[PDB]
Design a protein around this motif. Structure first.
Motif, PDB file in Angstrom:
ATOM      1  N   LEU A   1      12.799  16.693   5.695  1.00 21.47           N
ATOM      2  CA  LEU A   1      11.570  15.934   5.512  1.00 21.47           C
ATOM      3  C   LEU A   1      10.888  16.190   4.161  1.00 21.47           C
ATOM      4  CD1 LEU A   1       9.974  16.182   9.084  1.00 21.47           C
ATOM      5  CD2 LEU A   1      11.526  14.456   8.133  1.00 21.47           C
ATOM      6  N   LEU A   2      11.304  17.235   3.446  1.00 23.93           N
ATOM      7  CA  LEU A   2      10.618  17.595   2.199  1.00 23.93           C
ATOM      8  C   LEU A   2      10.655  16.470   1.158  1.00 23.93           C
ATOM      9  CD1 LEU A   2      11.460  21.373   1.642  1.00 23.93           C
ATOM     10  CD2 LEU A   2       9.609  20.309   2.920  1.00 23.93           C
TER      11      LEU A   2
ATOM     12  N   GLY B   1       0.822  -1.192   0.000  1.00 27.11           N
ATOM     13  CA  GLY B   1       0.000   0.000   0.000  1.00 27.11           C
ATOM     14  C   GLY B   1       0.858   1.245   0.000  1.00 27.11           C
ATOM     15  N   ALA B   2       0.330   2.315  -0.586  1.00 28.84           N
ATOM     16  CA  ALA B   2       0.890   3.647  -0.443  1.00 28.84           C
ATOM     17  C   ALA B   2       0.022   4.363   0.573  1.00 28.84           C
ATOM     18  CB  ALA B   2       0.903   4.394  -1.775  1.00 28.84           C
ATOM     19  N   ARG B   3       0.606   4.715   1.711  1.00 27.44           N
ATOM     20  CA  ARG B   3      -0.145   5.357   2.781  1.00 27.44           C
ATOM     21  C   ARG B   3      -0.722   6.676   2.279  1.00 27.44           C
ATOM     22  NH1 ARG B   3       0.774   8.166   8.100  1.00 27.44           N
ATOM     23  NH2 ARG B   3      -0.149   6.876   9.761  1.00 27.44           N
ATOM     24  N   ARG B   4      -1.951   6.987   2.688  1.00 26.24           N
ATOM     25  CA  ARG B   4      -2.623   8.216   2.262  1.00 26.24           C
ATOM     26  C   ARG B   4      -1.837   9.445   2.707  1.00 26.24           C
ATOM     27  NH1 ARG B   4      -6.528   9.323  -1.314  1.00 26.24           N
ATOM     28  NH2 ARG B   4      -7.788   7.596  -0.480  1.00 26.24           N
ATOM     29  N   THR B   5      -1.468   9.460   3.982  1.00 31.88           N
ATOM     30  CA  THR B   5      -0.661  10.525   4.551  1.00 31.88           C
ATOM     31  C   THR B   5       0.743   9.999   4.822  1.00 31.88           C
ATOM     32  OG1 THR B   5      -2.620  11.492   5.630  1.00 31.88           O
ATOM     33  CG2 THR B   5      -0.459  12.209   6.427  1.00 31.88           C
ATOM     34  N   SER B   6       1.770  10.737   4.409  1.00 33.53           N
ATOM     35  CA  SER B   6       3.143  10.316   4.690  1.00 33.53           C
ATOM     36  C   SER B   6       3.419  10.380   6.190  1.00 33.53           C
ATOM     37  CB  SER B   6       4.150  11.183   3.933  1.00 33.53           C
ATOM     38  OG  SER B   6       4.089  12.536   4.359  1.00 33.53           O
ATOM     39  N   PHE B   7       4.397   9.608   6.659  1.00 34.61           N
ATOM     40  CA  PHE B   7       4.835   9.709   8.049  1.00 34.61           C
ATOM     41  C   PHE B   7       5.382  11.107   8.338  1.00 34.61           C
ATOM     42  CE2 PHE B   7       5.809   4.915   7.765  1.00 34.61           C
ATOM     43  CZ  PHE B   7       4.518   4.607   8.127  1.00 34.61           C
ATOM     44  N   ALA B   8       6.125  11.641   7.373  1.00 35.63           N
ATOM     45  CA  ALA B   8       6.741  12.955   7.520  1.00 35.63           C
ATOM     46  C   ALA B   8       5.693  14.048   7.733  1.00 35.63           C
ATOM     47  CB  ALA B   8       7.611  13.278   6.304  1.00 35.63           C
ATOM     48  N   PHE B   9       4.640  14.044   6.922  1.00 37.97           N
ATOM     49  CA  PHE B   9       3.630  15.096   7.003  1.00 37.97           C
ATOM     50  C   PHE B   9       2.766  14.969   8.258  1.00 37.97           C
ATOM     51  CE2 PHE B   9      -0.407  17.174   5.566  1.00 37.97           C
ATOM     52  CZ  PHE B   9       0.112  18.452   5.504  1.00 37.97           C
ATOM     53  N   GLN B  10       2.494  13.732   8.662  1.00 42.72           N
ATOM     54  CA  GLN B  10       1.785  13.475   9.913  1.00 42.72           C
ATOM     55  C   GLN B  10       2.567  14.062  11.088  1.00 42.72           C
ATOM     56  OE1 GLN B  10       0.250   9.470  10.614  1.00 42.72           O
ATOM     57  NE2 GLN B  10       0.870   9.564  12.770  1.00 42.72           N
TER      58      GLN B  10
ATOM     59  N   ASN C   1      14.907  20.020  -2.533  1.00 43.04           N
ATOM     60  CA  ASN C   1      14.859  18.742  -1.815  1.00 43.04           C
ATOM     61  C   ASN C   1      13.523  18.014  -1.943  1.00 43.04           C
ATOM     62  OD1 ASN C   1      16.290  16.822  -0.146  1.00 43.04           O
ATOM     63  ND2 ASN C   1      14.933  17.414   1.548  1.00 43.04           N
ATOM     64  N   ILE C   2      12.956  18.009  -3.142  1.00 44.82           N
ATOM     65  CA  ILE C   2      11.701  17.303  -3.387  1.00 44.82           C
ATOM     66  C   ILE C   2      11.949  16.001  -4.152  1.00 44.82           C
ATOM     67  CG2 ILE C   2       9.424  17.443  -4.510  1.00 44.82           C
ATOM     68  CD1 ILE C   2      10.050  19.269  -1.995  1.00 44.82           C
ATOM     69  N   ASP C   3      11.212  14.947  -3.807  1.00 44.46           N
ATOM     70  CA  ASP C   3      11.249  13.695  -4.570  1.00 44.46           C
ATOM     71  C   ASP C   3       9.874  13.436  -5.162  1.00 44.46           C
ATOM     72  OD1 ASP C   3      11.512  11.139  -5.659  1.00 44.46           O
ATOM     73  OD2 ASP C   3      11.695  10.130  -3.728  1.00 44.46           O
ATOM     74  N   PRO C   4       9.717  13.706  -6.466  1.00 42.62           N
ATOM     75  CA  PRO C   4       8.417  13.551  -7.126  1.00 42.62           C
ATOM     76  C   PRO C   4       7.990  12.090  -7.256  1.00 42.62           C
ATOM     77  CG  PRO C   4      10.103  14.047  -8.746  1.00 42.62           C
ATOM     78  CD  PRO C   4      10.752  14.207  -7.390  1.00 42.62           C
ATOM     79  N   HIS C   5       8.906  11.156  -7.023  1.00 41.72           N
ATOM     80  CA  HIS C   5       8.549   9.748  -7.048  1.00 41.72           C
ATOM     81  C   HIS C   5       8.242   9.207  -5.657  1.00 41.72           C
ATOM     82  CE1 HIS C   5      10.526   9.906 -11.072  1.00 41.72           C
ATOM     83  NE2 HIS C   5       9.551   9.061 -11.357  1.00 41.72           N
ATOM     84  N   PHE C   6       8.237  10.073  -4.645  1.00 37.07           N
ATOM     85  CA  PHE C   6       8.005   9.581  -3.285  1.00 37.07           C
ATOM     86  C   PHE C   6       6.657   8.889  -3.130  1.00 37.07           C
ATOM     87  CE2 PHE C   6       5.952   9.980   0.836  1.00 37.07           C
ATOM     88  CZ  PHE C   6       6.845   9.283   1.629  1.00 37.07           C
TER      89      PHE C   6
ATOM     90  N   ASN D   1       0.544  16.677  -2.725  1.00 34.62           N
ATOM     91  CA  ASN D   1      -0.531  17.446  -2.099  1.00 34.62           C
ATOM     92  C   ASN D   1      -0.122  18.025  -0.741  1.00 34.62           C
ATOM     93  OD1 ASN D   1      -0.700  14.666  -1.039  1.00 34.62           O
ATOM     94  ND2 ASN D   1      -2.565  15.364  -0.017  1.00 34.62           N
ATOM     95  N   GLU D   2       0.789  17.331  -0.065  1.00 33.56           N
ATOM     96  CA  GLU D   2       1.290  17.761   1.232  1.00 33.56           C
ATOM     97  C   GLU D   2       2.210  18.972   1.085  1.00 33.56           C
ATOM     98  OE1 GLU D   2       2.975  14.048   2.523  1.00 33.56           O
ATOM     99  OE2 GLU D   2       1.025  13.267   3.178  1.00 33.56           O
ATOM    100  N   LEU D   3       3.125  18.897   0.124  1.00 36.84           N
ATOM    101  CA  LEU D   3       4.014  20.015  -0.167  1.00 36.84           C
ATOM    102  C   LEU D   3       3.200  21.245  -0.574  1.00 36.84           C
ATOM    103  CD1 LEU D   3       6.589  17.902  -2.164  1.00 36.84           C
ATOM    104  CD2 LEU D   3       7.033  19.018   0.037  1.00 36.84           C
ATOM    105  N   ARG D   4       2.187  21.014  -1.412  1.00 41.60           N
ATOM    106  CA  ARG D   4       1.287  22.095  -1.818  1.00 41.60           C
ATOM    107  C   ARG D   4       0.594  22.731  -0.619  1.00 41.60           C
ATOM    108  NH1 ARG D   4      -0.874  22.479  -7.238  1.00 41.60           N
ATOM    109  NH2 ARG D   4      -2.924  22.922  -6.304  1.00 41.60           N
ATOM    110  N   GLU D   5       0.120  21.901   0.307  1.00 40.15           N
ATOM    111  CA  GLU D   5      -0.533  22.427   1.505  1.00 40.15           C
ATOM    112  C   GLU D   5       0.419  23.264   2.366  1.00 40.15           C
ATOM    113  OE1 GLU D   5      -3.098  19.753   3.547  1.00 40.15           O
ATOM    114  OE2 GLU D   5      -2.892  20.773   5.482  1.00 40.15           O
TER     115      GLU D   5
END
Ligand code: M7G
Ligand code: MG
Ligand code: MG
Ligand code: NA
Length: 209
Positions: free
Chosen positions: A72-73, A45-54, A95-100, A79-83
């Motif tokens: 953590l970026l 599964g791909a978690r809905r919310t990342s651990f980092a953003f939580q 420091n963004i990973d678009p494949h994360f 959607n999290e980075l956007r928020e």
């Protein structure tokens, strides 16, 4: 074997994986399902919310102040980075990973009046929008002990093999909608993920022993 403990390290995690005999039924027990489809694919599964953003959200404490470690970026979704940057809107960010994606085994909390297998069935149901059912459970039980190197926390979970009725395509044509999971996919499509080595090891230990 029943004896062996294996420790993996990633840039974010250290995880101990040890074969055990029985799952200690109690208050805080996580049971993970390592799912194999009818046509023999391991699921992740791909978690809905990342651990980092939580974590980041839980670290805030002010109306007028937002606080974020730049490290953590690279471990957050689009959607999290956007928020985070929606109000400031600077020219760009680094420091963004678009494949994360936050890869996790499906599964959840063991409830009071609940058996292990019932827990696995129910949680797989909830996290797949009623689309996963278990044909047969494996006999190998694993204990997973994870240290998160970024947040300095230790987690305990237990994993079992679930041979499910559905095929890979059965779960990869309609998008997931529940609050816990944003995607269900083949683990073998995740070869470049930080977690791929130890997750693949978990599956291989569960099926090839
Ligand atoms: C918040 N969090 C949860 N996990 C993993 O996810 C499992 C569930 O932990 P949980 O936070 O109790 O449940 P939740 O994910 O539904 O919120 C844990 O046993 C851990 O294996 C986590 N794993 C890491 N490496 N870092 C985290 O911050 C983290
Ligand atoms: Mg949590
Ligand atoms: Mg759940
Ligand atoms: Na802009």
């Amino acid at each position: 074997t029943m004896d062996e403990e294996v420790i993996f390290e990633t840039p974010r995690e250290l995880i101990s994986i040890k074969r055990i005999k029985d799952i200690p039924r109690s208050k805080d027990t996580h049971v993970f399902a390592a799912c194999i489809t009818s046509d023999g694919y391991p699921l992740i599964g791909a978690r809905r919310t990342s651990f980092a953003f939580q974590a980041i959200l839980s670290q805030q404490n002010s109306d007028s102040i937002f606080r974020v470690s730049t490290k953590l970026l690279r471990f957050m979704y689009y959607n999290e980075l956007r928020e985070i940057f929606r109000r400031l809107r600077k020219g760009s960010i680094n420091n963004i990973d678009p494949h994360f994606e936050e890869l996790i085994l499906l599964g959840g909390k063991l409830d009071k009046k609940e058996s292990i297998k019932d827990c696995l069935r129910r949680e797989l149901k909830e996290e797949s929008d009623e689309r996963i059912t278990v044909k047969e459970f494996g006999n190998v039980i694993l204990k997973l002990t994870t240290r998160d190197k970024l947040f300095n926390k230790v987690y305990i979970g237990y994993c079992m093999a679930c041979f499910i009725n559905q095929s890979l395509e059965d779960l990869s044509h309609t998008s997931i909608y529940n609050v816990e999971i944003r995607k269900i996919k083949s683990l073998n499509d995740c070869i470049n993920d930080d977690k791929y080595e130890y997750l693949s090891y978990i599956y291989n230990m569960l099926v090839n022993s």
